[PDB]
């Protein structure tokens, strides 16, 4: 008589299975066959549990884990209860400091491989051979919110990849936009305080829609470019799988001859680009604040590995000055029209972690963890970052020995004369702890730099100037990049940007700030400032109306790479559809629905007014995954409503609103047979409407129209029609 169910339904299948199918589970039990050298190196610190006795941390078996030791069944607890003291103590000290920023984050394991050797341009060992597989750990994140904030907030996303290479750890620590907010790291804390909750009262959580953030923006137009991206649909992604990733700074590649090439790094999503819309995103933070962390986890269990393609923008040394902005200014993007992104290799994220604290929470990414073959530039934001990511570990992860924490451990050799941290794991046997040393024949030894397996050596850049605290004049341009961004966007994308600003700005309490931000917008584009100013109830003045727009960027009038939806590359594999059930589903409808979806890798969740089962018209038993309220349209890409006893749900508030919300958020909707009577609620015509798939029954045609709407991600053409619906 043990407490597990007799039929074994406590324990999930060790098999790729869809979202909702099984309980979720630590990667090593859900996917024991997936391996790589990092994950196998972790074996020495994994701990199982089955068929083991419960014990104190010192090895003692425990007989009663239900009670304190007391003088009598009703007496005081005694101080000699060391079992209770240890158990409580450990609990008492469970928590460690959250990250200063990107505290909220979700990770996975995986690997990378280059498409071709890159030894022409860099000696980076991990890029030397397309047969060389490099294990990676990746953590995606928000920026502002605490470790327990929501996933779908309007924020920048972080995208950090730790490469466990054969010649050291390389950390690629990037974001989901190609620029940053600020130019010099010295104002880092200023900006971060400005967007972080306000100090007197700790409000708002994971939001920029407050007074101080915009106050800052309005006084530092350097921020405006990235603020643009934030306000766009870019700042509210569908999935960590459906965003682009950027290294932001220009770095250097260095080859075996010592030739430097400037580079900026990119991650390009094989899943394509896709993002939510605001109302959907905002309300989803309430309905499932773990939406991204969840979707990532499930996508992986489900076999839908997130894949990204590592690409380089490369710029030769003698081109440093050909662009009319500065390559070292991190608030400027390099348009792909001027420098295209060359795909170099690919990363696959193919297994979840076992313990979220152990592996995610404690991981330490730092951009200055580079390897031979790479080097820095004078980007004055990058310069700063170098300092901070080592420092902060000392209090986050408790000391200098954070590289000994399992997930952070290199997978190549590491030896030196560094001794003695807090929580030191390694026990050095070297008779010497210094060099030069004769007593251990100077081991371990320096290694001269070389083609492969060499010492690190910095590129010998010429430095000429005086010791000054002064912004480069070449950084003094703020508007042409925002403008470029804005004119690259589709019309509906621009409505969103407008509504983005209007919403945020409307929660700035001190109205003079609203005006000052509008004033900034005037310098970027007058359409934009008009639309926003209308929505805030502001009249642009004559002065403002006449403001000259900034120059084209190097003669560019737009760059299609900056739009999410310019050239849809939306991909349905991994997406999810809601199927609204009634007690009497027409089975051959449903057969055809699930069969079609399954063929293109699209997941379904069957929903009803309650849990349990319903039966088909042919007596197939249909298990319910959640109720209408339990799994709102927010959480799905489309809604399908098959035929049957429509009378069952026809007057159900929740089923109707499921459709109304779905419609307002521009999602595809498919109604078979009598389900078409739901058109009434969505105030649709009897003639039909684009984006509403309809028919006597679900067939070849019905499903294909639907899936094709899905390849378009959203039904943009619906926008004009949604303001009348009240959802």
């Amino acid at each position: 008589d043990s407490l597990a169910p007799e039929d074994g339904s406590h324990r999930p299948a060790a098999e790729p299975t869809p979202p909702g199918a099984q309980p979720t589970a630590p990667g090593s039990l859900k996917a024991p066959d997936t391996r790589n050298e990092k994950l196998n190196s972790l074996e020495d610190v994994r701990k199982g549990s089955e068929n083991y006795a419960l014990t104190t941390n010192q090895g003692v078996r425990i007989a009663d884990d239900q009670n304190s030791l007391r003088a009598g069944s009703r007496g005081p607890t005694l101080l000699e209860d060391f079992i209770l003291r240890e158990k409580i103590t450990h609990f008492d000290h469970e928590r460690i400091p959250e990250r200063i920023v990107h505290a909220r984050g979700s990770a996975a394991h995986g690997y990378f491989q280059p498409y071709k050797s890159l030894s022409d341009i860099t000696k980076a060992d991990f890029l030397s051979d397309p047969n060389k597989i490099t294990p990676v750990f990746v953590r995606f994140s928000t920026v502002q919110g605490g470790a327990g904030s929501a996933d779908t907030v309007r924020d920048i996303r972080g995208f950090a990849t730790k490469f466990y290479t054969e010649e050291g750890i390389f950390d690629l620590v990037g974001n989901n936009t190609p620029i940053f907010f600020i130019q010099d790291a010295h104002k880092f804390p200023d900006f971060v305080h400005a967007v972080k909750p306000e100090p007197h009262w700790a409000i708002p959580q994971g939001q920029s829609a407050h007074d101080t953030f915009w106050d800052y923006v309005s006084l530092q137009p350097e921020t405006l470019h990235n603020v643009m991206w934030a306000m766009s649909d870019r700042g509210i992604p569908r999935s960590y799988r459906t965003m682009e990733g950027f290294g932001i700074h220009t770095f250097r590649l260095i080859n075996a001859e010592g030739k430097a090439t400037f580079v900026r790094f990119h991650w390009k999503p094989l899943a394509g680009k896709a993002s939510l819309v605001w109302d959907e995103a905002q309300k989803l933070t309430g309905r499932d604040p773990d939406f991204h962390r969840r979707e990532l986890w499930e996508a992986i269990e489900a076999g839908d590995f997130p894949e990204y393609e590592l690409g380089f923008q490369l710029i030769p040394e003698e081109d440093e000055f050909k662009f009319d902005f500065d390559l070292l200014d991190p608030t400027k993007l390099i348009p792909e029209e001027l420098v295209p992104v060359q795909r170099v290799g690919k990363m696959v994220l193919n297994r979840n972690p076992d313990n979220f604290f152990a592996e995610n929470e404690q991981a330490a990414f730092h951009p200055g963890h580079i390897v031979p073959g790479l080097d820095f530039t004078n980007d004055p934001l990058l310069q700063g970052r170098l300092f901070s990511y080592t420092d902060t570990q000392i209090s986050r992860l408790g000391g200098p020995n954070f590289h000994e924490i399992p997930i952070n451990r290199p997978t190549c050799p590491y030896h030196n004369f560094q001794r003695d941290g807090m929580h030191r794991m390694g026990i050095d046997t070297n008779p010497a702890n210094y060099e030069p040393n004769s007593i251990n024949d100077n081991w371990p030894r320096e290694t001269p730099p070389g083609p492969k397996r060499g010492g690190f050596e910095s590129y010998q850049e010429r430095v000429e100037g005086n010791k000054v605290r002064e912004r480069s004049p070449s950084f003094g341009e703020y508007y042409s990049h925002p403008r470029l961004f804005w004119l690259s966007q589709t019309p509906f994308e621009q409505r969103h940007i407008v509504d983005g600003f209007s919403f945020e700005l409307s929660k700035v309490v001190r109205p003079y700030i609203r005006e000052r931000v509008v004033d900034q917008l005037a310098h970027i584009d007058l359409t934009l400032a008009q639309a926003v100013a209308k929505n805030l109830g502001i009249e642009l003045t004559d002065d403002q109306l006449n403001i000259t727009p900034p120059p084209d960027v190097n003669g560019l009038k737009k760059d299609p790479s900056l739009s999410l939806y310019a050239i849809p590359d939306g991909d349905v594999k991994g997406r999810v559809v809601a199927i609204l059930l009634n007690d009497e589903v027409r089975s051959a409808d449903l057969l055809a629905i699930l069969k079609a979806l399954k063929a293109k890798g699209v997941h379904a969740k069957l929903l009803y007014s309650r849990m349990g089962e319903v039966t088909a018209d042919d007596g197939t038993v249909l298990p319910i995954a959640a109720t209408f309220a339990g799994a709102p349209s927010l959480t799905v890409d489309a809604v399908i409503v098959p035929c049957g006893n429509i009378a069952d749900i026809a007057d159900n508030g929740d089923a109707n609103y499921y459709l109304m919300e779905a419609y307002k958020h521009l999602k595809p909707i498919a109604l078979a047979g009598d389900a078409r009577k739901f058109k009434a609620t969505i105030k649709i015509a009897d003639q039909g409407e684009e984006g509403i798939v309809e028919a006597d029954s679900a067939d070849g045609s019905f499903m294909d129209e639907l899936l094709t709407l899905m390849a378009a991600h959203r039904v943009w053409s619906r926008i004009p029609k949604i303001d009348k619906i009240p959802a």
């Binding site: 498409y115 690409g311 029209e337 295209p340 992104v341 060359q342 795909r343 170099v344 560019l556 009038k557 737009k558 299609p560 790479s561 310019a566 050239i567 849809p568 590359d569 094709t708 390849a711 378009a712």
Partner: protein, 63 residues
């Protein structure tokens, strides 16, 4: 043979394509015309793409 009807429809329909090249670059735009050997892709300027250098041509939606 196949290239021709496929390319021809993309153009005639003015549907956005992506063109992935052997060098790992991805070009995007609308197909303006083609050739025994090349394709013209419209964007800000038109540009000449040598077929021997293209690896895949990917429509943004069904034809």
């Amino acid at each position: 043979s196949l290239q021709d009807p496929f390319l021809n429809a993309l153009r005639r329909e003015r549907v956005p394509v992506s063109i992935y090249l052997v060098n790992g670059i991805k070009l995007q735009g609308q197909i303006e015309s083609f050739d025994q050997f090349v394709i013209l892709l419209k964007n800000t300027v038109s540009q000449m793409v040598y077929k021997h250098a293209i690896s895949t041509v990917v429509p943004s939606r069904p034809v």
